[PDB]
Design a protein around this ligand. Sequence first.
Ligand SMILES: *[C@@H](C(=O)N[C@H](C(=O)N1CCC[C@H]1C(=O)O)[C@@H](C)CC)[C@H](O)C(=O)NCCC
Length: 251
Amino acid sequence: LPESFDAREQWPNCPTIKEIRDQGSCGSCWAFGAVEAISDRICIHSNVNVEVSAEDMLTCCGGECGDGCNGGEPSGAWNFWTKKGLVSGGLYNSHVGCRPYSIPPCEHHVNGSRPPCTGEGDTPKCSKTCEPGYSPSYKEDKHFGCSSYSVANNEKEIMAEIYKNGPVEGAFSVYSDFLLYKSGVYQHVSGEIMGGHAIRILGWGVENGTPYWLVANSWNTDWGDNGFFKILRGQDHCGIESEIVAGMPCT
Ligand SMILES: *[C@@H](C(=O)N[C@H](C(=O)N1CCC[C@H]1C(=O)O)[C@@H](C)CC)[C@H](O)C(=O)NCCC
């Protein structure tokens, strides 16, 4: 495997790999790391670029994925894609796709022009309809996965999975010193644990001797390094290598 790899550069024709979404004031991070990597994988493995709906995943999976805005289970999310499929849907207020995200963007531990995020909010209704003016129908806009699986806590297998099949979903423990990240390779030094956080991993490299995983967060682009961050690789730091999940699209 190369010393560095950035899936944005490797698949130029899949612009979802460069996007950073915003989960709003909702603990929907489990749903976001999944629909972002599922969008990327649809594009990498097609005979075609769709923004898969975080709304659909978030509201309609139910208890197999956990508990909506209160948090959930990442492999549970990849499973819903193979069983029920996912419709398209872009950013809040975009009117792109069947079911755009309905929770407003907010400032995540950073000051800016949006309202601050609050805690978690209420999970919206599972509405099986597309927005007005969109075609096809909800039922017809579903995209299915044909496999859902877990990747072993093994840095070489994770690197080979991203290299071969595209970005993956991961989860790690957030301590309060992570909230303040701006650049470089994050390593945890102080802070109260704040929760597990599911994100999308899309590459790796070595920044001045320190090996890292290139990660994309769902806290909008004004947090961290334009929404992305680097975290220490190879030592299962904050559990970053312990809960990798991925899956393959049909056809
Ligand atoms: C993951 C999640 O979304 N966690 C929280 C988060 O990212 N939030 C909540 C409000 C918006 C945003 C923020 O802090 O800016 C937070 C607790 C992380 C510090 C969710 O809780 C989950 O699904 N966890 C399970 C993953 C295995």
